[PDB]
Design an enzyme around this catalytic site. Structure first.
Site, PDB file in Angstrom:
ATOM      1  N   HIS A 176       0.776  -1.230   0.000  1.00 59.62           N
ATOM      2  CA  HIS A 176       0.000   0.000   0.000  1.00 59.62           C
ATOM      3  C   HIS A 176       0.811   1.286   0.000  1.00 59.62           C
ATOM      4  CE1 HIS A 176      -3.501  -2.414   0.006  1.00 59.62           C
ATOM      5  NE2 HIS A 176      -4.312  -1.409   0.288  1.00 59.62           N
ATOM      6  N   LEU A 353      -1.907  -8.009 -10.281  1.00 59.44           N
ATOM      7  CA  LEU A 353      -1.316  -9.255  -9.813  1.00 59.44           C
ATOM      8  C   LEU A 353      -1.219  -9.360  -8.289  1.00 59.44           C
ATOM      9  CD1 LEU A 353       2.002 -10.881 -11.070  1.00 59.44           C
ATOM     10  CD2 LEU A 353       1.696 -10.187  -8.676  1.00 59.44           C
ATOM     11  N   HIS A 357      -6.246 -11.191  -2.114  1.00 59.96           N
ATOM     12  CA  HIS A 357      -7.329 -11.339  -1.162  1.00 59.96           C
ATOM     13  C   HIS A 357      -7.596 -12.750  -0.648  1.00 59.96           C
ATOM     14  CE1 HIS A 357      -7.713  -7.445  -3.052  1.00 59.96           C
ATOM     15  NE2 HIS A 357      -8.225  -7.038  -1.907  1.00 59.96           N
ATOM     16  N   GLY A 495       5.340 -11.989 -11.504  1.00 61.65           N
ATOM     17  CA  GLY A 495       5.513 -11.164 -10.324  1.00 61.65           C
ATOM     18  C   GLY A 495       6.943 -10.908  -9.892  1.00 61.65           C
TER      19      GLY A 495
END
Ligand SMILES: *[C@@H]1O[C@H](CO)[C@@H](O[C@H]2O[C@H](CO)[C@@H](O[C@@H]3O[C@H](CO[C@@H]4O[C@H](CO[C@@H]5O[C@H](CO)[C@@H](O)[C@H](O)[C@@H]5O)[C@@H](O)[C@H](O)[C@@H]4O)[C@@H](O)[C@H](O)[C@@H]3O)[C@H](O)[C@H]2NC(C)=O)[C@H](O)[C@H]1NC(C)=O
Ligand SMILES: *[C@@H]1O[C@H](CO)[C@@H](O[C@H]2O[C@H](CO)[C@@H](O[C@@H]3O[C@H](CO[C@H]4O[C@H](CO[C@@H]5O[C@H](CO)[C@@H](O)[C@H](O)[C@@H]5O)[C@@H](O)[C@H](O)[C@@H]4O)[C@@H](O)[C@H](O)[C@@H]3O)[C@H](O)[C@H]2NC(C)=O)[C@H](O)[C@H]1NC(C)=O
Ligand SMILES: *[C@@H]1O[C@H](CO)[C@@H](O[C@@H]2O[C@H](CO)[C@@H](O[C@@H]3O[C@H](CO[C@@H]4O[C@H](CO)[C@@H](O)[C@H](O)[C@@H]4O)[C@@H](O)[C@H](O)[C@@H]3O)[C@H](O)[C@H]2NC(C)=O)[C@H](O)[C@H]1NC(C)=O
Ligand SMILES: *[C@@H]1O[C@H](CO)[C@@H](O[C@@H]2O[C@H](CO)[C@@H](O[C@H]3O[C@H](CO[C@@H]4O[C@H](CO)[C@@H](O)[C@H](O)[C@@H]4O)[C@@H](O)[C@H](O)[C@@H]3O)[C@H](O)[C@H]2NC(C)=O)[C@H](O)[C@H]1NC(C)=O
Ligand code: MNH
Ligand code: MNH
Ligand SMILES: *[C@@H]1O[C@H](CO)[C@@H](O[C@H]2O[C@H](CO)[C@@H](O)[C@H](O)[C@H]2NC(C)=O)[C@H](O)[C@H]1NC(C)=O
Ligand SMILES: *[C@@H]1O[C@H](CO)[C@@H](O[C@H]2O[C@H](CO)[C@@H](O)[C@H](O)[C@H]2NC(C)=O)[C@H](O)[C@H]1NC(C)=O
Ligand SMILES: CCCCCCCCO[C@@H]1O[C@H](CO)[C@@H](O)[C@H](O)[C@H]1O
Ligand SMILES: CCCCCCCCO[C@@H]1O[C@H](CO)[C@@H](O)[C@H](O)[C@H]1O
Ligand SMILES: CCCCCCCCO[C@@H]1O[C@H](CO)[C@@H](O)[C@H](O)[C@H]1O
Ligand SMILES: CCCCCCCCO[C@@H]1O[C@H](CO)[C@@H](O)[C@H](O)[C@H]1O
Ligand SMILES: CCCCCCCCO[C@@H]1O[C@H](CO)[C@@H](O)[C@H](O)[C@H]1O
Ligand SMILES: CCCCCCCCO[C@@H]1O[C@H](CO)[C@@H](O)[C@H](O)[C@H]1O
Ligand SMILES: CCCCCCCCO[C@@H]1O[C@H](CO)[C@@H](O)[C@H](O)[C@H]1O
Ligand SMILES: C[C@H](C(=O)O)c1ccc(-c2ccccc2)c(F)c1
Ligand SMILES: C[C@H](C(=O)O)c1ccc(-c2ccccc2)c(F)c1
Lengths: 553, 553
Positions: A176, A353, A357, A495
């Site tokens: 975040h 990507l 959750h 990733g």
């Protein structure tokens, strides 16, 4: 005249350019290939692709033979392999960045305007026959239905690698700081202008906010004492915008770098740990440099925390996620002999990507108590009620959910997946198979090959009509997982490039910055070089609880 | 306790850090030296410095033996030497950038806040015994007196290298895209956030301004027709802020990227040339790509002009300035095998060093007419009265003044030099001799050695008291000039690194961007690769006048 670039004719990173009214040309410059479609390989290119083992085979090698890896990890081979990993993965990410939501071509505006997320593959041209290019149906499957049918959790599936909630919340907290999509500007835009590990989720993404959070004494961050413990200050003492539900008293709102961290105690928990670490480092610095003013103390501590973060992310976070027996290593010097750009621009695909959750559980267990989502979300007293150690212990003990495989997203947050799919269509992301190729993998030839099973595959084929119409995010989450792994090969092959480039691409990893003086001397430099998740918590708490990214035995 | 760093103890780029109440330590990391002050060389460091010829000797080699250079320039040796020049000069500039006016140490704020100019050497600590550190008098010489005595022109001194006003105005126009000191924020701050060759002086330094300048048709810039010729549009048609004397209405102002260009016909002349080139390129692009929209046409043309600019600057501008027999070359590929960061941050020292006001003449001759500063400055009709061709011819024929040597700045603009010296003290720039060492030269041991004479040197010694107190700018302008050169060695040894890093550091020079597709194909790529000052002018004018950076023979 159907736009020829809708067929994605240019292979191996060749660039499709429209010429005349209906022609196209592929710019194969430096792709290692030639020919109209960048498909004719040069000798070295052919050898490299012919001898390279599959991602699946390499995954096997890295997760078997502990005895051999232990031996290798104690030798220079560890460095050789880490350097290889860093360079091979990073090279798949363009630097300087290329495209953005407005420009499907290189431009000075894409290079300079950092309010834009960048993108790896250009968008699906707006004039294409189908939403995904030329394959699939005229209309994509309903996002809601797709989510209910294939992503909704029925029964909780724990991660086989033993990943826990301490890890899950670290991931959410950590990401975040660089994923902050702008509500006002829309999809494709970000407010995290640092585009990486700048720790803006601790210090704020803008200067005035940072100034509101700073004590301006001893280089420290403001804080408050509760139950004799240190916590972030309230919005009253640090007048900063925080996203709390209307009706919550200001005194109950904590002020931290990231405006949305009041959403979960797990997020505020990490905000507290890092704030405590910042102030602890300020203390160590002052002892070493009594002549320093508040500014230098603050700036130097921030650099140290940035280094501590990258150290922990590579050696513990990525280590846990990969499941590799190879001992990963954070050492900027591994790249001093190679060609590498110390810059990073966050890609919209990387954002997508990282919507992990499925990691969230059915409920949150803290000791004998079980807390529901309604008792956890936006709970402004739980962190202080239990304190840092108690929550770290509980989150470190509770298993997180498996990410890949499908059907493992709790109903409480399924709406997020629905919106990710919808935004993917707004961003006009190319099909999953195009991304497979862009990241060195062969495209899937059918849905059964993708899922590894038959029932879901049949239903997906009915809905999408063609494997080449399957979208990015759904592909990532529905792909069959590696054996006993948290997710499939694509999550890793796609990733890893983004994550590693974002870690080592940081300026503190450059030859110019990576020196003891940057961190206030040997004391500060060693804090970075020996940082550990355990030390991050325990050097900042009364007692030391169970702390790890893995559930206990 | 006197701040130990006031003595500039750390040599060879070692970093001085305060420890305890009165100690200091030098961080010698990667300097090639060890010891308390980074003065003990490693074996290879010693060899390199021992076999390394002086700048004066290398300058000699580059300006003699034309026959040998003619052979070299036609072989790959030209490339080998250009690459060597590029890497050796560029390596002296830190990248990522280090300090700024607020931080005399590495910090995340210095790295991220681009409103700040960076700086190569930290400021003179505010607590030092004297203004320049520990040497000199408690008070520096009056800036106005210093300028009157040593910088004021008494008799015009032309540049022995034959540099003309066409060059002088190119220099002023070109540098004003990256030197835009903020009056609001003050010294140390800039509005040219591109920090390099982004051509913001043509397209504007902000998006809003660019949008008012663009036609939004065919990728072109707005323009107006006068006497059948193309010129920048008026402010009435392109509502942009331009700095014009109060009372000059919008319909009589010309709107261009840089707000201050209305000040001189020489500046608007180049603004006009580049504007015409932009729209010309748009025409060529559209012919090749009829399906492209206004946005892509505009962005692609901008990239082409950036490339054309870098090409002309290296192969003609710097060539003229250097006077080298070696044929300089703009070829990004020369660095594809080297470790180089494709980014740039404008340094405050580079800004100071580029104040080349001595170039301006006593008056401006256009054919039979001789215009004074009062008739030239802010003249609103000269450009349109004469047209592009006539002014280019006149400026290409009139000699510019010699930059170095002293006493050659016309009284009309001497005040600028006074302010540069005053700004230097606000910025607290270290002494000239400290910069000499930072850029690989031995410090001067006396003013006589500096000037090469006795008169000015004696007065300078009296005023400054110590050679180690001599300031940066005065040092550059008073240093003896190379034989028959436009300026001294320091201007070259300090200027070359900043300039070359700024030119090649551009993202268009990176392997990622340097491809035909970036410029719309081979036609656009060739425009960049073959750009020339003569073509820039003549492909955009009715007739072809004498155009060059050197006066005719
Ligand atoms: C990074 O990139 C993003 C995306 O581009 C930037 O977004 C923002 O900036 C854009 C440009 O400011 C915003 O675009 C909007 O455009 C609307 C239409 O305006 C048209 O342009 C002019 C308007 O001027 C006209 O003439 C007079 C002259 O003085 C003027 O006063 C008057 O307003 C009049 O309209 C004209 O040619 C046309 O007719 C149109 O009016 C604007 O109305 C709107 O306000 C806005 O400017 C864009 O919306 C912004 N936000 C987003 C999310 O896109 C962002 O700024 C960039 N960041 C940086 C740092 O560069
Ligand atoms: C790049 O870097 C430059 C240089 O740092 C930076 O410059 C600009 O930004 C700073 C910070 O915004 C400006 O700061 C100036 O000083 C004061 C700030 O002092 C405050 O002190 C008191 C604290 O405020 C309290 O908090 C309450 C919160 O709700 C507030 O409502 C009350 O004010 C309360 O008292 C307060 O008394 C005072 O009002 C201030 O808040 C500002 O007031 C002043 O106006 C200035 O902004 C710099 O001046 C400004 N410009 C310059 C040249 O320094 C750039 O922004 C940076 N750029 C980027 C992109 O980050
Ligand atoms: C902005 O620039 C324009 C030019 O683009 C200025 O207008 C021009 O001004 C000049 C002189 O002010 C005008 O001169 C013309 O030619 C002769 C020149 O003088 C002659 O040569 C010397 C000088 O005295 C003497 O020995 C001769 O006897 C003779 O006088 C002049 O005499 C003519 O009358 C004629 O004006 C030129 O024509 C004019 N051009 C235009 C199109 O206006 C303008 O003034 C300037 N603005 C400012 C603020 O100075
Ligand atoms: C924010 O988080 C706070 C946690 O710090 C919440 O609070 C705690 O909330 C719990 C749950 O309501 C509360 O529980 C008390 O009572 C429980 C009694 O129930 C027992 O356990 C089972 C549940 O029915 C039964 O099987 C059993 O028979 C018995 O009935 C007991 O289990 C708990 O241990 C505890 O005594 C805690 O006391 C609260 N703690 C504090 C500090 O107040 C708070 O509700 C959240 N806020 C919101 C709005 O949800
Ligand atoms: C309890 C748990 C939990 C809740 C309520 C939650 C909620 C949300 C909500 C609400 C949104 C914004 C959706 C919208 O439609 O605009 C969002 C975005 C997002 N979240 Mn999750 N999130 C996690 C856990 C949660 N997230 C975890 C675990 C991660 C793993 C790293 C994660 C990663 C993301 C990412 C990445 C975004 C996108 C952020 C951005 O683009 O601004 N998250
Ligand atoms: C006719 C001639 C002419 C005039 C009237 C002129 C005038 C000025 C004025 C006024 C200032 C701002 C000074 C202050 O004290 O704030 C300034 C700045 C500057 N000028 Mn000169 N300038 C030139 C020519 C001139 N300049 C030439 C030739 C060059 C060479 C490249 C040059 C380079 C500079 C630079 C560099 C700056 C500083 C820009 C910045 O910091 O904003 N120039
Ligand atoms: C390169 O890509 C094009 C585009 O997909 C391929 O398709 C073209 O050529 C085919 C061969 O005759 C035609 O049947 C297709 O109609 C035609 N499609 C388009 C969009 O023009 C082409 O075969 C590829 N060529 C190579 C050498 O791989
Ligand atoms: C390192 O640099 C310092 C500063 O130039 C030198 O000066 C210090 O030591 C001298 C030796 O006696 C003294 O005369 C100076 O007063 C003292 N100055 C300071 C900074 O306190 C020092 O000699 C150098 N040391 C070496 C090994 O080169
Ligand atoms: C040079 C020695 C080669 C030995 C062959 C090792 C065989 C490893 O085989 C691997 O098994 C995995 C499942 O367990 C699969 O997922 C991999 O794709 C497969 O390559
Ligand atoms: C230089 C790095 C080399 C990495 C190769 C390590 C791969 C470990 O390979 C292992 O070898 C064992 C042999 O006894 C087999 O029994 C295991 O199944 C196999 O996974
Ligand atoms: C036997 C152990 C080998 C360790 C080295 C692994 C690092 C190489 O990683 C490789 O990077 C490529 C580009 O991102 C991918 O396409 C490959 O699938 C991946 O295996
Ligand atoms: C074979 C290699 C021989 C190298 C000889 C080393 C010469 C450099 O000598 C150094 O010169 C500095 C400045 O004068 C001193 O400050 C150092 O103390 C001194 O060791
Ligand atoms: C003329 C001989 C020159 C020899 C070059 C020295 C090479 C660097 O030698 C180094 O010296 C250090 C100091 O004791 C040791 O700690 C290192 O292990 C050693 O490699
Ligand atoms: C590979 C690069 C080589 C650069 C060397 C160029 C130096 C030119 O050297 C020149 O050689 C002439 C010989 O006829 C002498 O007469 C000149 O005085 C001398 O300056
Ligand atoms: C004979 C031709 C030689 C060409 C090589 C010239 C390029 C090397 O240039 C060198 O760069 C250094 C760092 O900026 C300076 O300190 C040196 O004085 C300068 O000569
Ligand atoms: C070291 C290893 C690899 O390169 O294979 C590896 C594996 C997975 C990741 C990864 C990290 C965060 C999100 C997605 C993938 C990563 F960053 C590195
Ligand atoms: C090619 C040559 C060199 O490196 O010696 C050289 C010489 C002078 C400059 C230079 C250019 C603009 C301002 C100041 C110096 C430059 F950029 C390059």
């Amino acid at each position: 005249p159907v736009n020829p670039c809708c067929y994605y004719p240019c292979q191996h990173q060749g660039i499709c350019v429209r010429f005349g009214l209906d022609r196209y040309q592929c710019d194969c410059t430096r792709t290692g290939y030639s020919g109209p479609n960048c498909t004719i390989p040069e000798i070295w290119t052919w050898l490299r692709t012919t001898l390279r083992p599959s991602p699946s085979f390499i995954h096997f090698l890295l997760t078997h033979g502990r005895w051999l890896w232990d031996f290798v990890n104690a030798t220079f081979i560890r460095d050789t392999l880490m350097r290889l990993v860093l360079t091979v993965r990073s090279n798949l990410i363009p630097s300087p960045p290329t495209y953005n939501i407005a420009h499907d071509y290189i431009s000075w505006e894409s290079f300079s305007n950092v309010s834009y997320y960048t993108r790896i593959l250009p968008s699906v041209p707006r004039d294409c026959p189908t939403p995904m290019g030329t394959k699939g149906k005229k209309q994509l499957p309903d996002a809601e239905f797709l989510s209910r049918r294939f992503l909704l959790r029925r029964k909780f599936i724990p991660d086989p690698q033993g990943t826990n909630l301490m890890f899950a919340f670290f991931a959410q907290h950590f990401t975040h700081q660089f994923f902050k999509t702008s509500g006002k500007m829309g999809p494709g835009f970000t407010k995290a202008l640092g585009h990486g590990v700048d720790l803006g989720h601790i210090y704020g993404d803008n200067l005035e906010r940072q100034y509101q959070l700073r004590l301006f004494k001893d280089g420290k961050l403001k804080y408050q004492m509760l139950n004799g413990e240190v916590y972030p200050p309230s919005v009253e003492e640090a007048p900063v915008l925080m996203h709390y539900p209307r009706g919550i008293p200001p005194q109950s709102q904590m002020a931290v770098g990231q405006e949305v961290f009041g959403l979960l105690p797990g997020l505020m928990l990490y905000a507290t740990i890092w704030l405590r670490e910042h102030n602890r480092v300020c203390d160590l610095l002052k002892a070493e440099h009594p002549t320093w003013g508040d500014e230098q103390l603050f700036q130097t501590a921030r650099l140290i925390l940035i280094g501590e973060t990258i150290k922990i992310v590579i050696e513990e976070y990525v280590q846990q996620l990969s499941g590799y027996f190879l001992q990963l290593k954070f050492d900027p010097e591994l790249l001093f002999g190679a060609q590498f750009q110390y810059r990073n621009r966050i890609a919209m695909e990387f954002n997508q990507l990282y919507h992990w959750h499925p990691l969230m559980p059915d409920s949150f267990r803290v000791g004998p108590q079980d807390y529901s989502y309604e008792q956890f979300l936006f709970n402004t007293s739980m962190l202080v009620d239990y304190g840092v150690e108690a929550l770290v212990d509980a989150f470190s003990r509770q298993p997180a959910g498996r990410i890949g495989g499908g059907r493992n997203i709790d109903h409480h947050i399924l709406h997020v997946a629905v919106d990710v799919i919808k935004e993917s269509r707004v961003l006009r992301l190319q099909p999953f198979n195009e991304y497979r190729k862009r990241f060195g993998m062969k495209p899937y030839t059918s849905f059964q090959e993708l899922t590894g099973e038959k029932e879901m595959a049949a239903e997906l084929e009915e809905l999408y009509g063609d494997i080449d119409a399957l979208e990015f995010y759904p592909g990532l989450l529905l792909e069959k997982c590696h054996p006993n792994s948290i997710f499939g090969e694509s999550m890793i092959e796609m990733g890893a490039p983004f994550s590693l480039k974002g870690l080592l691409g940081n300026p503190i990893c450059s030859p110019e910055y990576w020196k003891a003086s940057t961190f206030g001397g040997e004391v500060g430099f060693n804090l970075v070089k020996t940082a550990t998740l355990k030390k991050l918590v325990c050097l900042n708490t009364k007692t030391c609880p169970y702390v790890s990214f893995h559930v206990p035995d």
